[PDB]
Ligand binder design. Sequence first.
Ligand SMILES: Nc1nc2c(ncn2[C@@H]2O[C@H](COP(=O)(O)OP(=O)(O)O)[C@@H](O)[C@H]2O)c(=O)[nH]1
Ligand SMILES: Nc1nc2c(ncn2[C@@H]2O[C@H](COP(=O)(O)OP(=O)(O)O)[C@@H](O)[C@H]2O)c(=O)[nH]1
Ligand SMILES: [Mg+2]
Ligand SMILES: [Mg+2]
Lengths: 171, 171
Amino acid sequence: MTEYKLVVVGAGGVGKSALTIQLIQNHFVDEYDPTIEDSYRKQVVIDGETCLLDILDTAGQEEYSAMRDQYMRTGEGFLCVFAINNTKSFEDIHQYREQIKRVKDSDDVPMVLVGNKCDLAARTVESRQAQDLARSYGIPYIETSAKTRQGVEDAFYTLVREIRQHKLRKL
Amino acid sequence: MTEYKLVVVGAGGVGKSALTIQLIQNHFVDEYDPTIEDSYRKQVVIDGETCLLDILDTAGQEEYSAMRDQYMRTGEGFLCVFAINNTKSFEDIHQYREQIKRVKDSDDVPMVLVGNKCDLAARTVESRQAQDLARSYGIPYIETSAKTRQGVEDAFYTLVREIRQHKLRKL
Ligand SMILES: Nc1nc2c(ncn2[C@@H]2O[C@H](COP(=O)(O)OP(=O)(O)O)[C@@H](O)[C@H]2O)c(=O)[nH]1
Ligand SMILES: Nc1nc2c(ncn2[C@@H]2O[C@H](COP(=O)(O)OP(=O)(O)O)[C@@H](O)[C@H]2O)c(=O)[nH]1
Ligand SMILES: [Mg+2]
Ligand SMILES: [Mg+2]
């Protein structure tokens, strides 16, 4: 079947493992070891297509850049996640995008911007600032909650769709 | 009269000296010494108010950050300029904004985003991506041309207006 190599990138504590796990085993996990970086697979049907998703849940002292190299140049799409309540994780998004553009040699690599923890009623990053940021980047922005599961399938599947279009564009 | 300390910041070659000089001596300068960093003053009337503008035309190996310190913590407003035809100068904007927020201790310091050289019919940065970026930052975006003078007065005066409102907000 088709295999999409995805990389979930972002500051620590944003919820990268919680989103990944949520998608894979459909259950929320608080306290997953901040240090552990590993891949996860699941077979899914997205728009009629059966495919295998290969996800790298990035963890690591890797200064706001390219965690698991031999997966970064290979990733076909990146999920840039920040937390709706941590403005710093949100400002750090530019740096990940630049490293991703840097290793991949292009400003046309599939990516989706994810504002996670939207279940927290608080926020230090308003929905509108994120959408303008995404807009200027030309990428989608989706709000998710690993805690309640809202938006996690839309986030990853939007990323697959982006990869699909991008492949279809060389013809 | 009132004095507004402004700092013009941005990658080399964008046109910081050409904008500054344009405003001060109303004439275009090609080839101004890339190394020279100095201040310039002019008395102007902006919205009925007579004021003295004190501008620091930043130049210097100062790694995408805070050129002329004893002016950065003191600047009351910053003009972030990039060239409409140099995408890198445009991506470097985030770093200047962060240094500016960093020394000034706040994400509420007056600034205006300036897309210069708009006389060149070309472009690698489209007007819309810049405006979304500005929007997400909450700041104005103005396109100017040091070469033809279009927009240079609007850029600096928009910056003064921003400083004015910001001062008026503590009451
Ligand atoms: N309320 C809430 N907490 C979350 C959400 N996603 C993750 N968390 C919590 O945020 C912390 C960090 O999650 P984790 O996936 O370990 O972070 P990361 O892998 O370093 O990005 C943990 O306490 C998670 O339980 C979310 O959507 N909602
Ligand atoms: N076409 C055009 N060239 C410009 C404009 N502004 C500056 N330049 C040219 O761009 C180069 C860099 O200008 P300068 O002010 O020295 O750069 P900076 O001080 O390092 O930001 C010079 O060749 C300037 O003449 C502009 O609005 N239009
Ligand atoms: Mg983790
Ligand atoms: Mg100069």
